[PDB]
């Protein structure tokens, strides 16, 4: 019913946040069919800072407690054809992530799939009516391969593998 994300260390319940946006990296190369693949951003802090939809919370992959869109999801990028440029996704309806306190934060499965379908809808306007696929992070250091954030001086690492594993036609 929910999407449980393994986190280290255990985020206390007061560190629950509102997911207001994502940051993605479109996988390059030559695909075999009408499929475009996206992963959590493979860049660094410069891709997150130039998004400018974040608040005071410092986070990777997912924007916590940041700017929401007015009506519908708004995706933006400096070049849609440069896979080295990240794709900034700004949600309109925040998705609440609730951390229990035993090392795992929860996310509703249906309400996350609804946001991924609206995101895949906005992505087809820039890359044509194709198949949109979300895949886990391609790797990297712990703070970027995982959904990381700060809360009260501490730094938490949450594995975001279960959040990016869907296909939308």
């Amino acid at each position, epitope marked *: 019913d929910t999407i449980t994300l393994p986190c280290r260390p255990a985020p206390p319940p007061h560190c629950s946040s509102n997911i207001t946006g994502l940051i993605l*990296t479109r*996988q*390059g*190369g*030559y*695909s*075999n069919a009408n499929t475009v*693949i996206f*992963r959590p*951003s*493979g*860049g*660094d*802090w410069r891709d997150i800072a130039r998004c400018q939809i974040a608040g005071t919370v410092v986070s990777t992959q997912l924007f916590l407690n940041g700017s929401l869109a007015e009506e519908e999801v708004v995706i933006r990028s400096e*070049d849609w*054809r*440069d*896979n*080295a440029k990240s794709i900034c996704v700004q949600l309109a309806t925040s998705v609440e992530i609730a951390c229990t306190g035993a090392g795992h934060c929860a996310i509703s499965r249906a309400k996350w799939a609804n946001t991924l379908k609206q995101i895949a809808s906005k992505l087809r306007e820039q890359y044509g009516a194709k198949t949109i696929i979300f895949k886990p*992070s*391609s*790797g*990297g*250091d712990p*703070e*970027f*391969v995982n959904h990381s954030f700060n809360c009260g001086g501490e730094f938490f690492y949450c594995a975001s593998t279960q959040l990016f594993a869907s296909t939308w036609f």
Partner: antibody
Amino acid sequence: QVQLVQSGAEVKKPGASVKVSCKASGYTFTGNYIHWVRQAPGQGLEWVGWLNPNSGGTNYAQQFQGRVTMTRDTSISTAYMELNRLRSDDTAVFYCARGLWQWEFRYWGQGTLVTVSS
Amino acid sequence: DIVLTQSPGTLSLSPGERATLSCRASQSVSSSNLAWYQQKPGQAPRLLIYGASSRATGIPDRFSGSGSGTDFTLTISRLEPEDCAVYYCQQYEGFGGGTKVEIKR
């Protein structure tokens, strides 16, 4: 002056794996992405993927997703590119490149010949 | 995606004449991301032109670039015997097939 020095040539058997290094110097190693380009004998250039040395993030080409892995070591300014499960048609020369800002590859390594044969 | 078609596959020219290498894109692209390279046998590619027309440092002025939309042209005003190599055009991670410039006798 900016220069890239790669590892030496490799002779591998089909099914094995190979790891190629690329040592950078003359600039801040974490400031620019490291790309890799493949060129089969008598063929053209083919982009393999880039790596962010500051964060370790990678973006592999779809045709190489699964067999390639790119890492780095910031204390020696050396980037690595590993290709597993080699086939006979994987015999090619691998270059590491750096752009003026990203894709304007002005700095190349001398190349590393990787021949696969039994 | 973006496909870069270079023509001809092999260009033969008498020493001292003008070269004209074209790079056709399958779709309309921006000129700010068009690059040209030169690769001699046994060596790595060398950046000649970036941004469709901006010449790289150390490149002789006889190399020139122009074009927009889908057609881009690399021009060698006076072909030197040292200019015999394969030339590629680039758009992000996409490379052209390459044009071999040889001497015509």
